[PDB]
Amino acid sequence: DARDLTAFQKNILTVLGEEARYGLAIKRELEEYYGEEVNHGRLYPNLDDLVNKGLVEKSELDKRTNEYALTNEGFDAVVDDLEWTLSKFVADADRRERVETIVADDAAAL
Amino acid sequence: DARDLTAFQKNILTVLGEEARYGLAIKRELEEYYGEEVNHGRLYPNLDDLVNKGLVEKSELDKRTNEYALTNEGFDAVVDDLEWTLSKFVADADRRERVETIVADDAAAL
Ligand SMILES: [Cl-]
Ligand SMILES: [Cl-]
Ligand SMILES: [Cl-]
Ligand SMILES: [Cl-]
Ligand SMILES: [Cl-]
Ligand SMILES: [Cl-]
Ligand SMILES: [Cl-]
Ligand SMILES: [Cl-]
Ligand SMILES: [Cl-]
Ligand SMILES: [Cl-]
Ligand SMILES: [Cl-]
Ligand SMILES: [Cl-]
Ligand SMILES: [Cl-]
Ligand SMILES: [Cl-]
Ligand SMILES: [Cl-]
Ligand SMILES: [Cl-]
Ligand SMILES: [Cl-]
Ligand SMILES: [Cl-]
Ligand SMILES: [Cl-]
Ligand SMILES: [Cl-]
């Protein structure tokens, strides 16, 4: 089950929900989120874990470079947690309008 | 600091984003999420941590019942996580359509 993942592992999945990324690209995406450095020794063992759990697939481009992508299971985990989060956040009309605005503005910036 | 919370602590904040709740009520909402029992020894020390961080307020009610609610800081942390999650998930028009359906269905069920 994916609901037991650590916050750091879920954030990797969130990053890859946007698009498949090289390991180094995931690291900088996480660093922009956390506002502090993400060590190589924290990211890559957790990438390994998610690959072994069946949530991420690894494509070997070169020695010292790989691309990571969500599996179907991984995407299901991302959508499952988003649904649960929204089921609790969308608690009244004001909350509905707030999310509608977030999504619309996110779309506009694409 | 809020972006450094554990998955369990973030899930507590999510639960209280829906509405204020007694400790016992938080426990069962989390149990429904995880599909497994949540021990008192895990929930309550984490609630105390969130209170100490200023993200939850503990209202001590009559006769040994406590009710927990988000502070303004706690609500900020829930929205900030949701915005980051949505910024990564809403990557194209089909992703936007899926989120908008989830939000609308949730609102309709209220
Ligand atoms: Cl965690
Ligand atoms: Cl973590
Ligand atoms: Cl990349
Ligand atoms: Cl890599
Ligand atoms: Cl790169
Ligand atoms: Cl780190
Ligand atoms: Cl490594
Ligand atoms: Cl989520
Ligand atoms: Cl759900
Ligand atoms: Cl509504
Ligand atoms: Cl709101
Ligand atoms: Cl956790
Ligand atoms: Cl979480
Ligand atoms: Cl309650
Ligand atoms: Cl209890
Ligand atoms: Cl109760
Ligand atoms: Cl804090
Ligand atoms: Cl308090
Ligand atoms: Cl964001
Ligand atoms: Cl989609």
Side-chain angles (χ1 to χ4, degrees), chain A residues 10, chain B residues 7 10-11:
Chain A
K10 296 183 188 275
Chain B
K10 288 184 206 287
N11 290 338

PDB file of all heavy atoms in Angstrom, chain A residues 10, chain B residues 7 10-11, ligand 13:
ATOM      1  N   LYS A  10       6.677  10.476  -0.911  1.00  0.00           N
ATOM      2  CA  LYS A  10       5.516  11.013  -1.609  1.00  0.00           C
ATOM      3  C   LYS A  10       5.885  12.220  -2.456  1.00  0.00           C
ATOM      4  O   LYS A  10       5.289  12.440  -3.518  1.00  0.00           O
ATOM      5  CB  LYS A  10       4.437  11.393  -0.615  1.00  0.00           C
ATOM      6  CG  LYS A  10       3.903  10.215   0.140  1.00  0.00           C
ATOM      7  CD  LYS A  10       2.780  10.658   1.066  1.00  0.00           C
ATOM      8  CE  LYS A  10       2.364   9.521   1.963  1.00  0.00           C
ATOM      9  NZ  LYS A  10       1.361   8.609   1.315  1.00  0.00           N
TER      10      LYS A  10
ATOM     11  N   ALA B   7       4.736  12.622   7.086  1.00  0.00           N
ATOM     12  CA  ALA B   7       3.479  12.311   6.406  1.00  0.00           C
ATOM     13  C   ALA B   7       2.335  12.204   7.404  1.00  0.00           C
ATOM     14  O   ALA B   7       1.223  12.681   7.149  1.00  0.00           O
ATOM     15  CB  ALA B   7       3.622  11.001   5.628  1.00  0.00           C
ATOM     16  N   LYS B  10       1.363  15.674   8.537  1.00  0.00           N
ATOM     17  CA  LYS B  10       0.629  16.364   7.477  1.00  0.00           C
ATOM     18  C   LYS B  10      -0.800  15.840   7.375  1.00  0.00           C
ATOM     19  O   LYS B  10      -1.738  16.614   7.148  1.00  0.00           O
ATOM     20  CB  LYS B  10       1.329  16.208   6.126  1.00  0.00           C
ATOM     21  CG  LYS B  10       2.603  16.994   5.993  1.00  0.00           C
ATOM     22  CD  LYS B  10       3.166  16.865   4.591  1.00  0.00           C
ATOM     23  CE  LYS B  10       4.655  17.068   4.612  1.00  0.00           C
ATOM     24  NZ  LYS B  10       5.049  18.498   4.826  1.00  0.00           N
ATOM     25  N   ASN B  11      -0.976  14.526   7.538  1.00  0.00           N
ATOM     26  CA  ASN B  11      -2.309  13.929   7.456  1.00  0.00           C
ATOM     27  C   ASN B  11      -3.206  14.409   8.593  1.00  0.00           C
ATOM     28  O   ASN B  11      -4.414  14.594   8.403  1.00  0.00           O
ATOM     29  CB  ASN B  11      -2.196  12.403   7.445  1.00  0.00           C
ATOM     30  CG  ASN B  11      -1.599  11.859   6.144  1.00  0.00           C
ATOM     31  OD1 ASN B  11      -1.633  12.519   5.110  1.00  0.00           O
ATOM     32  ND2 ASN B  11      -1.059  10.643   6.197  1.00  0.00           N
TER      33      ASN B  11
HETATM   34 CL    CL C  13       0.893  12.952   3.886  1.00  0.00          CL
END
